Amino acid sequence: DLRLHLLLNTSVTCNDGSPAGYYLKESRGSRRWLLFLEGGWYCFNRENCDSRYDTMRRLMSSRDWPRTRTGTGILSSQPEENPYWWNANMVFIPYCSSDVWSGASSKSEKNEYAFMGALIIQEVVRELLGRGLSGAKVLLLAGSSAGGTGVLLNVDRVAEQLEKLGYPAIQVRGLADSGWFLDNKQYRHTDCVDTITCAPTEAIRRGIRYWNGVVPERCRRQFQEGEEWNCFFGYKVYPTLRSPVFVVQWLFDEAQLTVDNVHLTGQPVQEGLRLYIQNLGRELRHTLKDVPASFAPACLSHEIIIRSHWTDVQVKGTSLPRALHCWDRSLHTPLKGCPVHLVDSCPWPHCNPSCPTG
Ligand SMILES: *[C@@H]1O[C@H](CO)[C@@H](O)[C@H](O)[C@H]1NC(C)=O
Ligand SMILES: O=C(O)[C@@H]1CCN(c2ccccc2)C1
């Protein structure tokens, strides 16, 4: 249902220099726009992006992008699959910058790759205005995993872009899915080699210099020069944002456990690992105590909002599509039977019976 449009500005490129783009399915009756940021980890050094270019080149190049994409989950136009925003204008921005959407550089005779993730977002927004976005009432910038962190990094930058362009009426909002990470200690130590096993703290420290990534303004002014890597972590950057942001985060995100060098696959879970996993879930719940619009089930899973069965998980008897709807009403204090702060308290993966089974 979603049609590919490569960016008309040819200089806003993927990692290999091929043009970036976006998939679009218009809904001319609706004033609502969903711009989804794809995820897909990252690469924080040259001789490791090359490995990514060999087996994950679709995340670094638009050469072989399909002309058409199917909208799933919150990007679906069917009420059965998306009871929340099925009538909205759908935009899927493919992740081809490998920079957690923070780059604003350009490939040259001194850089192998281009990291323009932040420039991709603003250019898509720029080119969407002439295709109906100028009439929008709500622009919800959503994303999963790396895209979810990209939302936190870019939602204020999009709001200010629409304001400088002369669109004060467009309410820019954020939906950050599975991009709320902790810079915690690993369960077992590894050296930072390879993307999936490197500790979260050291991954971003290496990455942000390598991509020359940018961070939201007020967050940069708190941590200042050399410490902007702090702003890639939700519990640090979220208090500095001005746009309304809904946070969706599994309490036991598989990617968070991966960068922590945790592998729940074999029966014996010793008391040391049990303590680590329980403390991890406790710490994540604590970072969300002051996030008024949040959805955090106690599940071991990865991503939600573009999975076809995202309507099934419940926290305290409320599904995410309903929680997202109550969030809409809050922005039209607590509502009558329409909760927006939904954080599980039980301390072990799958203690919520509605957790995804597979
Ligand atoms: C295209 O995007 C690049 C990257 O930011 C920018 O420098 C350039 O001014 C843009 N060109 C046009 C015509 O918008
Ligand atoms: O699943 C993914 O896309 C990646 C897993 C680790 N990520 C991350 C870590 C720390 C800060 C921000 C992002 C994003």
The letter for the amino acid at 159 is A
Helix, strand and coil content of the chain, in percent to the nearest 5, comes to 35, 15, 50
Which ligand sits nearest to residue 250's alpha carbon?
A: 2
Mutate to test the pocket of ligand 2, among 100, 258, 287 (most ligand atoms within 8 A of CB): 100
Pick the catalytic residue: 61, 99, 294, 302? 302
124/112 Cα distance (integer angstroms): 24
CA atoms of 142 and 165, how far apart (whole Å): 21
User: Which structural domain, as residue segments, surrounds residue 258?
Assistant: 1-358
The strand ranges marked E within the chain are 2-6, 21-25, 32-37, 68-69, 89-93, 138-144, 171-177, 245-248, 252-253, 294-296, 300-301, 314-315, 318-319, 341-343
The answer to whether 145 is a known catalytic residue is yes
Q: How many domains does the chain have?
A: 1
Residue 183 alpha carbon, nearest atom of ligand 2: 10
Which of these is catalytic: 156, 183, 253, 260? Answer: 253
Q: Which among 129, 142, 117 has a CA at the least distance from the CA of 215?
A: 117
- Most ligand 1 atoms within 8 A of CB, residue of 6, 12, 107 to mutate: 12
Gap positions in the chain, given as the residue before each gap (C–N > 2.5 A)? Answer: 332
CA of 39 to the centre of ligand 2 (A): 9
Q: What is the DSSP letter of 108?
A: B
Give 4 Cα–ligand 2 centroid separation in angstroms. 26
Q: How far apart are CA 307 and CA 280, in angstroms?
A: 25
DSSP labels for 20-32? PEEEEE--TT--E
Give 289: exposed, middle or buried? Use CB within 10 Å, 0-12, 13-18, 19+: exposed
Tokens representing 36? Answer: 């989804």
For 18, the 3-state DSSP assignment is: coil
Active site residue 330: no
Resolution in A: 2.1
Q: Find out whether 183 and 151 touch, Cβ atoms under 8 Å.
A: no
Rounded Cα–Cα distance for residues 150 and 336 (Å)? 32
C-alpha distances (whole Å) from 54 to each of 16, 50, 138 are 12, 6, 39
In terms of Cα–Cα distance, which of 253, 249, 255, 210 is closest to 229? 210
Ligand 2 centre to CA of 69 (Å) is 24
191 in catalytic set: no
Residue 259: count of CB within 10 angstroms of its CB:
25
Structure tokens at 22: 């976006």
* Nearest ligand, measured from the Cα of 9: 1
Lookup: tokens for 82: 């998306």
Q: How far apart are CA 312 and CA 353, in angstroms?
A: 11
CA-to-CA separations, 357 to 114, 142, 201, 352, in angstroms, rounded: 39, 24, 30, 11
* Ligand 1 pocket mutation pick from 9, 122, 165 by most atoms within 8 angstroms of CB: 9
- Nearest to 252, CA basis, from 281, 287, 278: 281
Distance (Å) from CA 256 to ligand 2 centroid: 7
Q: How far is the CA of 334 from the centre of ligand 2 (A)?
A: 32
- For 48, the enclosing helix (H) or strand (E) is helix 46-55
Q: How far apart are CA 322 and CA 311, in angstroms?
A: 9
143 close to 150: Cβ distance less than 8 angstroms: yes
